[PDB]
Amino acid sequence: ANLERTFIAIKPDGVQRGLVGEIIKRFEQKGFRLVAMKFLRASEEHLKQHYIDLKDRPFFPGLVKYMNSGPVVAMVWEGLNVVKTGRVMLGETNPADSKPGTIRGDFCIQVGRNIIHGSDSVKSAEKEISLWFKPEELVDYKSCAHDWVYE
Amino acid sequence: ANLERTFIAIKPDGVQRGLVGEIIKRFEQKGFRLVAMKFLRASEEHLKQHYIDLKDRPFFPGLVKYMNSGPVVAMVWEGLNVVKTGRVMLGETNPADSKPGTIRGDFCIQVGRNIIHGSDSVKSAEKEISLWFKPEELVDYKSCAHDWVYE
Amino acid sequence: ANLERTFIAIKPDGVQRGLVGEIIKRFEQKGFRLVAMKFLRASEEHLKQHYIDLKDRPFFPGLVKYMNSGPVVAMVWEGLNVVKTGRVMLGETNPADSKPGTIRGDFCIQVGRNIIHGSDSVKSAEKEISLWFKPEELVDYKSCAHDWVYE
Amino acid sequence: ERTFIAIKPDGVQRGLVGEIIKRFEQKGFRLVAMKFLRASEEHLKQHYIDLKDRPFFPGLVKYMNSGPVVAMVWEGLNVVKTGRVMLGETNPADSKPGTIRGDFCIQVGRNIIHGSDSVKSAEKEISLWFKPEELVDYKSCAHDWVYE
Amino acid sequence: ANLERTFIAIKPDGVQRGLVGEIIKRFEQKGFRLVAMKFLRASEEHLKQHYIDLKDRPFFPGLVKYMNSGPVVAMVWEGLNVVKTGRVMLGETNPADSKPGTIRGDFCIQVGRNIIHGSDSVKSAEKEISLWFKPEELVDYKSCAHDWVYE
Amino acid sequence: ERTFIAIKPDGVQRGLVGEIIKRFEQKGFRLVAMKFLRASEEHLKQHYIDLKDRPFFPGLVKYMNSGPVVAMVWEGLNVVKTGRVMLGETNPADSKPGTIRGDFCIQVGRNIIHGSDSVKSAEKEISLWFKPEELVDYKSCAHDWVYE
Question: Which residues does the record give as ATP binding sites (chains D, F)?
Fold first, then answer.
């Protein structure tokens, strides 16, 4: 019995500005389940593969370089509609348009330094999860409060 | 109309997930006055009364059962437009639609486990207060900051 | 020993200064179980009974007036060593001696305005619970996290 | 860009100074200037000069002089417009949960905070409330992580 | 009456690490009254005046240079035993020895980067206040919760 | 220096991962490595090899395997000792308010977190739980504000 999953990465700026715990707490307190997590400096080639659909966009080389300029926190979270809801929690990709109460709305200013990534769709999420994690890094466990989050 | 009151109940899930203090802090920090509060397991019959308006709805049986499945924190809060503002603070009844920054937006996922109830109108508020509280349980006192919250 | 209980009251100053939610959160996050809670203005008659052991202290008259000067939040909390641990959480009865991280240490200054009471022993806790609550106001339920708080 | 933010007497009285500053700090804006004062009625009449002919102008000045305020200047990209977004709408009733006014107050006449409405007004307010030498220049250690 | 006052300065590291609001909130929530506050880069000669009792200690020269390396937030706070209690809230001057729950215990590591200063005596406080502030920068007002903080 | 910190299964289950990480970040320590896993019984037997002949050892391994843990490496000046001071005493009963155990748990057998007890223990734990390539070298933007 597996719910939907999404890929969330805290970008180098989110690590550098000391926001790792704050971000994780927002997912925990919502009732989502942490399925996987690792901390690494992703290679430029790995980042190009992650962002392959953006490869022709003028910002893509600077995006790859910045994403490689420090470590990221890569995560998989599980729950009902976690992909869409995760994006709502993160706020709009451009922080200018992110509302107060969202992660980007509370904590950052510019699109090129927008602290976090979340998958845009279930299919994107599955691709991203497979790119970043080995299957055995996805931990199956039951949340003690599951029956108080879900009917 | 600084004397308006609303009924707020923390549902069994909210209790079970450790959110009582967080929820009360949100109402205190906003400037609303706590008028009444108690902690109880509401009987089936009491809840049937409370939800008589929904009694011919498909989710009604399940709702009554969930609401009897642990204790609730029942409260009365006072202030200007507290009914409507209380509801904005809680977020949409359906957590899927509740925005980050709201109680449901921040803390829950599914409508059948939506942590909290607030009255939908002044008329419903007065009925709910009467059902859940004895008049002698309503405490009259003056907030020391009242003249800094209200002109 | 996991069934011990203690009586905690947030004093009139704790209510007036908007600390109810903060205080409850501290007990929730520690792992203790909320057994009972109500909000009331305690009568002089009632408070004389509560503070019976301090009846000949020079500060007793003033203490009784203060404690009747606004409502209090009365609570019962359950868990292993909750009486001793509750007092550690609260701090010393003089706030000036209470350490940062404690409730009194963080939030108040003077002994006469020391925001909170906790039972000093198991015997006094049982007396205080009986005085402030009817047995039917003590709610029995099991915390979903119980087996992760206790071995 | 720079904006003027003032925590009004009710914000100070209700113990929200730290909370409010933390919001601006955590967002990535740079604090440029800050002072705490009871603004004189004459200083406030200047601040509110556009309103001198309105019947509520005396009561407004009385209120704004009725306790101290924290006056600040913050710097960042779009900080004028974004500061307003962070404060919430001028009426707390319309301010969303997550905003300063939405989280912390109830009535338009006790709405805890002001921020400049435009770059124009900001430069006016900054010149009025601060001496140039009170605007401190420094670079945030996290600058390269807030801005590309 | 005028209660005791202390001088508190948030050092350039406190400002750079985004701790100004956190620090101010801890003094507000304790119940102390903010009397004066400004934000400035202090001159080396001003800083030598402030630390003149330490002028023969080997750390003194480096301390003056660091304190001039960015702006500070200078404050005056008032309340009962605010000098002594303020120092308890800050923690030991050496963060190595500062307890969790204190400002230095929670937020810093090394004595040369110890985020904050508080006066060590009432006489020191009066000297520091006069050094950093004009008499007219000290604001007299009455806290709305004063009678709930003090008997 | 570096230390090994693990959030135990009860800390994960009770929703304390973010809280705990924030405490280390806000102190000024640098996160060097982090992974989330159900540690295998053999892995845990190695971690607790000194206790293998004690009667409580099977129960301990069983508990530590009963849910996922967050394994971390943190760096900073005397981080081994100071990490232990931040966690509090090994019995939560004796842990003071403000510490992780003092704030968040009750019973010694459900004490939410481990930190290395010594620099030698830290080195052994880091080598057991992480590959060398999983220890990430970067410089904190605030480094010169945390250290002289």
Answer: 8, 56, 84, 90, 101, 111
- Contact state of A17 with D28 under an 8 Å Cβ cutoff: yes
CA D107, A99, B78: angle at the middle one, nearest 5? 30
Q: Report the first-to-last Cα separation within chain E, whole angstroms.
A: 13
Residues of B in contact with E144 (CB under 8 A): 144-145, 147-148
Backbone φ, ψ for residue E74 (5° rounding): -95, 135
Spatial distance between the Cα atoms of B135 and B132, rounded to a whole number of angstroms: 10
HSE-up of C45 (CA within 13 Å, CB side)?
0
F136 interfaces chain A, CB cutoff of 8 Å: yes
Sequence ranges of the binding site of F for ATP: 8, 56, 84, 90, 101, 111
Residue of E146, E26, E100 lying closest to D19 (CA atoms): E26
**Resolution number, Å:** 1.3
Residue whose entry in the numeric block shows the structure tokens 């600040």: D72
**Dist CA A99 CA D85 (whole Å):** 8
Task: Round to whole Å and give the CA distance between F44 and C70.
Answer: 55
Biggest alpha carbon–alpha carbon distance for chain D = 49
3-state secondary structure B84-148: HHHHHHHCCCCHHHCCECEHHHHHCCCHHHCCEEECCCHHHHHHHHHHHCCHHHCCCCCCCCHHH
Task: Search chain E and give the residue with CA nearest B148.
Answer: E144
| Residue of chain A whose alpha carbon sits nearest to that of C147 | A144
Angle, helix E20-30 to helix D17-27, in steps of 10 degrees: 160
Assess contact for E50 and E125: CB atoms under 8 A. Answer: no
D146 part of contact set with chain E, CB < 8 Å: no
- What span, in angstroms and rounded, lies between the C-alpha atoms of B107 and B102? 8
The pair of three-digit structure tokens given for residue E99, joined into one six-digit string: 């307890």
Q: What is residue A13's three-state secondary structure?
A: helix
Subunit partners of chain A (3 or more CB pairs within 8 A)? B, C, D, F
Question: Is position E117 annotated as part of the catalytic site?
Answer: yes
**What is the residue range of D107's domain?**
1-148
Amino acid at E52: I
Dihedral pair phi/psi, residue A143, rounded to 5° = -65, 130
- Tokens representing C118 are 């906790």
- Name the nearest CA neighbour of D34 among E17, E74, E34, E25: E74
Q: Say whether E103 sits in a helix, a strand or coil.
A: helix
Backbone φ and ψ for B140, nearest 5 degrees, come out as -100, 125
**b/e map E1-11, b = 16+ CB within 10 Å:** eebbbbbbbbb
- Structural tokens at position A93: 């990709």
In whole angstroms, what is the distance from residue C93 CA to residue C111 CA?
Answer: 7
C141 touches chain A (CB under 8 A): no
The CATH number of whichever domain residue C125 belongs to comes to 3.30.70.141
CA E116 to chain centre: 6
Tokens, residue F3: 């230390």
| C148 → chain F, closest CA residue | F10
Could you tell me what percentage of chain C is helix, strand and coil, using 3-state DSSP and rounding each to the nearest 5? 50, 15, 35
d(CA A81, CA A42): 27
Q: Are strands E72-78 and E33-40 parallel, antiparallel or unpaired?
A: antiparallel
The count of domains in chain A is: 1
8 A C-beta contact, residue F135 and residue F35: no
F76: left (phi over 0), alpha (psi -120 to 50) or beta: left
Identify which of E37, A106, E81 has the alpha carbon closest to the alpha carbon of residue D19.
A106
CA distances C65 to C12, C55, C61, Å, are: 11, 13, 7
Is C30 marked within a binding site?
no
Residue A110 CA, chain-centre distance (Å), reads: 17
